[PDB]
Amino acid sequence: MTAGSESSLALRLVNGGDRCQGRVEVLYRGSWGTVCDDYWDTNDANVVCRQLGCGWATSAPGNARFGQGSGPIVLDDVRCSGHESYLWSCPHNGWLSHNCGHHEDAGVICSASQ
Ligand SMILES: [Ca+2]
Ligand SMILES: [Ca+2]
Ligand SMILES: [Ca+2]
Question: Which of 18, 20, 29, 33 sits a CA distance of 20 to 30 A from 45?
Answer without folding.
Answer: 29
